[PDB]
Symmetry: D2
Subunit: 227 residues, 4 copies
């Protein structure tokens, strides 16, 4: 199951659809443990931390099955928090420890890549991305992990830089994808949500939600407190 044409990157072709969270749908914050300093800025919860963990477990099972028997290289893109990647790796490590333990099944490799914005030399002057050297990914099966997909610009621009070194396959894992006017889709996606700005778990806003372990929409009270 690990081979996939390079031209299918960003299409989510043949993927298992994410959990769908309908528009303006939430849980009551009073039903969950929330930090006392965040209470004044949170009244509703989008994704409970426990529901995030159940979907990340399922994505790790889906990933382990797609690459079983193959050497896998997982890239952690350094945008915002490292939260989602850490949780995903923890479950993949546990599954690896038992499923397929009896073989010369080489364990997965982890890699950390940084990005920097760059203005190309063309008549539009539009932005793109510059990466760390990626030559080590030649002829490898690569999984790129990103906290959330919003416009899809980061993974589109990054994707072209990685295509240039000729990897064997390229897929995307992300915790959330937004339904927006704002095209690129992931292959292993946790949730599909409405077009709103979220915080909590691996997301933040000026460190105000650094100890909040559930996902919520950024409120006007938080924007105000801060600004």
């Amino acid at each position: 199951m690990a081979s996939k044409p390079i031209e299918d990157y960003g299409k989510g072709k043949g993927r298992i659809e994410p959990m769908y969270i309908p528009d303006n749908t939430f849980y009551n914050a009073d039903d969950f443990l929330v930090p006392p300093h965040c209470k004044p800025y949170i009244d509703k919860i989008l994704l409970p931390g426990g529901l995030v963990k159940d979907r990340v477990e399922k994505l790790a099972y889906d990933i382990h099955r797609t690459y079983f028997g193959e050497e896998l290289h997982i890239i952690c893109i350094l945008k915002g928090s490292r939260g989602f990647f850490n949780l995903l790796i923890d479950y993949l490590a546990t599954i690896q420890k038992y499923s397929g333990r009896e073989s010369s099944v080489p364990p997965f490799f982890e890699h950390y890549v940084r990005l920097k914005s760059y203005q190309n030399d063309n008549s539009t002057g539009q932005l793109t991305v510059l990466s760390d050297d990626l030559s080590i990914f030649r002829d490898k099966h690569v999984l790129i992990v990103e906290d959330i997909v919003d416009t899809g610009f980061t993974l589109t621009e990054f994707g072209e830089r990685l295509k240039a070194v000729g990897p064997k396959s390229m897929r995307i894992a992300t915790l959330v994808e937004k339904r927006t006017d704002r095209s690129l889709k992931g292959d292993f996606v946790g949730f599909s949500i409405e077009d709103v700005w979220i915080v909590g778990c691996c997301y933040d806003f000026n460190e105000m939600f650094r100890d909040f372990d559930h996902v919520a929409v950024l409120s006007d009270a938080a924007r105000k407190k801060f600004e």
Copy 2:
């Protein structure tokens, strides 16, 4: 309810002053294909009522609520004896972690865990077996007691046991349960620390089961016709 430790014995089973459980509306479910389900349970499960991670987040919040109610007090927790998957094991895990990291409360006796059976449990002294109480409840005289139960459907087991416990004169009596079913029955028993309020349906998964069919199913669901038919 919660809050102040002391509470009139007469309020047992009324859920007075409690923090209301998470409300799960009638006929509301999740897609089983979004979660990890054992292959052998798949023919019997199309929809999930409560994902296992949602169950754990609610148990964490109930452990918080309980700790705040009994802050600075000696607490006796009576667990209706269940197996490894019972609700009391997860609740105790969270209460033990909160207790271990509450440094300012080191002078308060840590909680005491007790096991009860609802029929006469016989034993032999000093033979190292588990101490399970049944006929003699005298150790609870003048103590703060919390009874922990997997689910309140009719609650008759808790009403009958509660009348026996009252006769020894405990200082306070409260109930913790993961799930309470909605009923039109008047004056039905209610818990004080309740995880979820659900429609009156029969559930399996997590601490619940039906002829061992869902012994490794880590989410809660309504017992289906195909599973009822398998027997």
Copy 3:
């Protein structure tokens, strides 16, 4: 492989030996998190709780290798929330959830049993606890789980009762065994630690509820025995 002659019960034949803890060998209690109320009764620690967890993970793996692909019935000699059986089952459940053959092997069964034949105390909706009738184990592969083996009399007696219903195989898992001065003394098949003959508290073990929140294992002190 799951097969094993019934007469080999209690011999520990063909086992993987347990981790050996030498005589008078301890860790400093100041290096670990200990409940303040227990601090006056604990100066040395025998087994840190994380060392207990690493050995339980290894035992679970050993058990999974022995019974892979077979129908397994695990007997918990009744204990509460801190019993060794709960921790063992947590790791066995994880290996089972990710075993590699989750559609082609039957998941294990858990049973709750009393040591002696008392009158059943069962009722509808309550935990099934077996006492007087052990007949469900006829022709089954059975694993009996106990917190610790000292003299071995408990498991010898219970063992004779289970042999009367004719199980397919019988093995024993225990966290600790004691190095007592006997010959032909019962021993387990999946054992966490071999320790010197001393009386222990902490984790699944206790002494008059004094170590109910103590998550490491230690020897029982005279200060502790004095109090009570």
Copy 4:
């Protein structure tokens, strides 16, 4: 015997007033057969130095010690981007659980996490805890410490999982273990990715070393 945040800056690297680390005597090991080890690692692992569970129990105790020292104060924790983030991640995990279940009695802003390469203005007048996987020569923390002192923090302490008894120097304030002068791998340390899925700590064998050097 103190658990208080204030501390003179000139005490940085001296380990003054610390709780000594667990002492692991020279030539003391555990049998590797008593633990779960990845099959591909087995031929390179002669014996184990520190079981993963022993590491976790020591990190939990360090986290408890850290929480008491800064209780009620705003704390800024720096993860030095040198080697693996394994030790920092485990330490933060325990500190976060203690914080979530500790004093819901107001104020005390929860701790902050920061990642530094190898600019510092944000640490002026702050309580700072610098986290490093292991201390060998002490050169990394001596150099970085002089740059941090320049911005004028309120206090500066160090947390590290292991310190080595090298040949006759910098010491941390919250230290897991004291070991002999050997090169280690596994759990939160690695060598050419060879021990990436190994959950316990061992000494790097010459067979492993010679595979790359």
